[PDB]
Amino acid sequence: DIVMTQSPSSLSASVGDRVTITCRASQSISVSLNWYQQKPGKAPKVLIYAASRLQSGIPSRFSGSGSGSHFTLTISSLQPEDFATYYCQETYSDLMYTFGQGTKVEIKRTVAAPSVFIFPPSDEQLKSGTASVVCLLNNFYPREAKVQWKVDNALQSGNSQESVTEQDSKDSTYSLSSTLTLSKADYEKHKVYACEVTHQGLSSPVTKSFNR
Amino acid sequence: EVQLVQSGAELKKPGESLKISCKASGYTFTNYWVVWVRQMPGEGLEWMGSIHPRDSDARYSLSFEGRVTFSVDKSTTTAYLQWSSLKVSDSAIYYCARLSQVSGWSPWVGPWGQGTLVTVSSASTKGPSVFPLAPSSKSTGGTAALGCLVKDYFPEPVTVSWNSGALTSGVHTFPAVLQSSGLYSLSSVVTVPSSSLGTQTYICNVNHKPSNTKVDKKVEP
Amino acid sequence: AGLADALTAPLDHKDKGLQSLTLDQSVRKNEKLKLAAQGAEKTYGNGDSLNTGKLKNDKVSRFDFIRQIITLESGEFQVYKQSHSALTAFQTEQIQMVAKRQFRIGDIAGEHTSFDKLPEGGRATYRGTAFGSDDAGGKLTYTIDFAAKQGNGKIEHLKSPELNVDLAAADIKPDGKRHAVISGSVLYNQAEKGSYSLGIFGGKAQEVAGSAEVKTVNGIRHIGLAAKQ
Ligand SMILES: [Cl-]
Numbered sequence: 327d328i329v330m331t332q333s334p335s336s337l338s339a340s341v342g343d344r345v346t347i348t349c350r351a352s353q354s355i356s357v358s359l360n361w362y363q364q365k366p367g368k369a370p371k372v373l374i375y376a377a378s379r380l381q382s383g384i385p386s387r388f389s390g391s392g393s394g395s396h397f398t399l400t401i402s403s404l405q406p407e408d409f410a411t412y413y414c415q416e417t418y419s420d421l422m423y424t425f426g427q428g429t430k431v432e433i434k435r436t437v438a439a440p441s442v443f444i445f446p447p448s449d450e451q452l453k454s455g456t457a458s459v460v461c462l463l464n465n466f467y468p469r470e471a472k473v474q475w476k477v478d479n480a481l482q483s484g485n486s487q488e489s490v491t492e493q494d495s496k497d498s499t500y501s502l503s504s505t506l507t508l509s510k511a512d513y514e515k516h517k518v519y520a521c522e523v524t525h526q527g528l529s530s531p532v533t534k535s536f537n538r
Numbered sequence: 539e540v541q542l543v544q545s546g547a548e549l550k551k552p553g554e555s556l557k558i559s560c561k562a563s564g565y566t567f568t569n570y571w572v573v574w575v576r577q578m579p580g581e582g583l584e585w586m587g588s589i590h591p592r593d594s595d596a597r598y599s600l601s602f603e604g605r606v607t608f609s610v611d612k613s614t615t616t617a618y619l620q621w622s623s624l625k626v627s628d629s630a631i632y633y634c635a636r637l638s639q640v641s642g643w644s645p646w647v648g649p650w651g652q653g654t655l656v657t658v659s660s661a662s663t664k665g666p667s668v669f670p671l672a673p674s675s676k677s678t679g680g681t682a683a684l685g686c687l688v689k690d691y692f693p694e695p696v697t698v699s700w701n702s703g704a705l706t707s708g709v710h711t712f713p714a715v716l717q718s719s720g721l722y723s724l725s726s727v728v729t730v731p732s733s734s735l736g737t738q739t740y741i742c743n744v745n746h747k748p749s750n751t752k753v754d755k756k757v758e759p
Numbered sequence: 760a761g762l763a764d765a766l767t768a769p770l771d772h773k774d775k776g777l778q779s780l781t782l783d784q785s786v787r788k789n790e791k792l793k794l795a796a797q798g799a800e801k802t803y804g805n806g807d808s809l810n811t812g813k814l815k816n817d818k819v820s821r822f823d824f825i826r827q828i829i830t831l832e833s834g835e836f837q838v839y840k841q842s843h844s845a846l847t848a849f850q851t852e853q854i855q856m857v858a859k860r861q862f863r864i865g866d867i868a869g870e871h872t873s874f875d876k877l878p879e880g881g882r883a884t885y886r887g888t889a890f891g892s893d894d895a896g897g898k899l900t901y902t903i904d905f906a907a908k909q910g911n912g913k914i915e916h917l918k919s920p921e922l923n924v925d926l927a928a929a930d931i932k933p934d935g936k937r938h939a940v941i942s943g944s945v946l947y948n949q950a951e952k953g954s955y956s957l958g959i960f961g962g963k964a965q966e967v968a969g970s971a972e973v974k975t976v977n978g979i980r981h982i983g984l985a986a987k988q
Binding site: 371 | 571573581582583584585587588597599633635643644645646647648650651652653667669670671672674681683685687689710711712713714715717723724725727729
């Protein structure tokens with residue numbers, strides 16, 4: 327019944343920046359308020375309880391303030407490892423301790439060009455009748471990147487899928503895999519397999535390729 | 539130490555029933571509320587309700603009040619969450635966790651279980667094939683990339699580690715992608731010094747519990 | 760549980776103390792109190808003594824009760840027993856008859872430690888129970904520093920988390936009869952959310968017993984306190 331809403335829902339700031347997340351309640355909840363941090367693929371971890379009480383093990387750059395219906399999570403100097411989404415939670419009511427919708431915190435860093443690799447299909451996979459050609463863009467920033475596939479200079483369309491990792495907790499970069507999927511028969515009909523990467527970190531597009 | 543260990547990832551058909559479990563240990567079971575939280579992948583935490591093991595006092599939020607049943611087994615200090623009739627929209631991760639408290643202060647949630655991924659669909663489970671992404675022979679005194687292609691599995695999730703966990707630095711395991719076939723695929727990669735290619739063993743450890751598939755692929759030049 | 764025994768058997772000094780509790784607050788001079796359990800029943804009796812000797816120590820013993828003047832009140836009667844102290848409580852279910860729930864502490868009795876014969880120094884840790892409406896699962900911990908003539912403590916693990924409060928530092932004092940007593944604040948998120956009062960019991964101050972009144976979002980809640988050693 328008590329509604330918690332956070333703002334913003336998403337933010338981006340440079341390492342060492344002061345980051346402020348606000349949490350609001352639909353009614354006064356005194357100081358019965360928690361802050362949680364959740365990183366990719368992990369359960370959340372409590373940072374603060376009772377609005378301003380720092381949990382042990384948590385760095386002091388995290389601090390909480392406010393009361394009644396308005397609360398704030400402050401990160402005094404945003405660190406790379408602080409990439410996560412942050413949740414408030416009211417613990418005022420008779421149990422039923424509802425959460426805010428969460429705020430994703432990302433790090434702003436300088437542009438970084440990807441290093442590129444291409445992987446032909448393994449002989450093993452070829453035996454099963456399909457060919458997966460993988461192109462990897464490693465540790466780049468920002469996330470926006472363009473990949474195009476060519477087979478004998480024929481531009482591919484509709485037969486590749488992309489995946490991007492969450493921002494790295496150490497260097498704050500992204501990585502991206504582009505997988506070109508072809509029948510074994512189509513794959514054996516061509517020679518030159520090329521991945522061409524376009525990214526702000528690159529003055530001119532980068533191509534990796536192989537023959538087979 | 540205090541632990542909450544939940545049961546494995548689940549695949550069920552719509553309309554079927556399901557009981558997932560949460561094994562509590564390292565503390566007095568009957569002194570703490572057990573809490574259940576739902577989380578759709580890429581979305582927020584959702585308080586489902588709680589139950590007190592001491593007398594099985596169960597509380598439900600309006601959105602889950604009839605669809606789920608909390609229960610507890612004190613002799614095994616295990617909490618249970620049970621659906622009688624699953625829907626596709628029940629597909630999500632579910633956490634149990636302890637409700638903790640320092641006397642004189644508002645409580646919080648934690649420790650947490652590792653979470654249980656529930657997938658509701660009529661499609662049947664399939665174990666993955668694992669293929670080497672062998673390092674280039676024309677590698678640069680520089681860096682080299684290698685990895686494993688984990689292809690054609692259902693449902694989520696698969697886990698990947700390298701050298702049984704000894705290798706974590708430079709590892710990128712990509713989020714699975716749903717292929718047009720309706721099966722999942724994913725690659726895990728790592729960049730290493732190219733001078734180590736000749737002398738260092740690299741093994742990706744793939745695990746797909748739902749199909750009881752566990753693979754250790756040595757990736758060579 | 761020996762509940763029936765407590766209702767039918769006479770006092771026996773060989774039983775584990777606290778051997779007897781004198782009902783006073785539990786039943787006013789003009790009223791009668793009937794307690795029933797395990798097939799037995801007995802009426803009291805302002806000034807009458809309850810055979811706590813038959814009950815288990817460090818547990819809540821429970822009876823059905825009716826309070827008459829004509830029935831005024833009925834519900835469950837709770838007794839928590841220690842060796843040199845004991846207390847009673849009323850979980851009200853029925854008043855004039857209509858259904859109505861209330862919780863209240865009755866008698867807090869035993870061998871009061873004299874404020875003038877307290878240990879002169881050293882610290883004592885008391886461990887025991889905090890019990891409220893529908894919840895006898897609370898853990899009480901309390902520490903008295905006898906050099907400083909001060910005590911403080913905490914309530915843990917009651918189902919209702921805002922009852923799990925800090926029992927703030929307080930002075931030991933003499934009451935009118937020179938009994939050693941401690942009255943202090945209840946703290947929750949550093950705000951005062953009520954008060955607690957403890958008496959020290961036993962010739963060597965082996966025990967504390969008393970109660971707390973705790974302000975909650977849904978109103979004031981009364982808690983019984985009892986700990987030992
Ligand atoms: Cl919620």
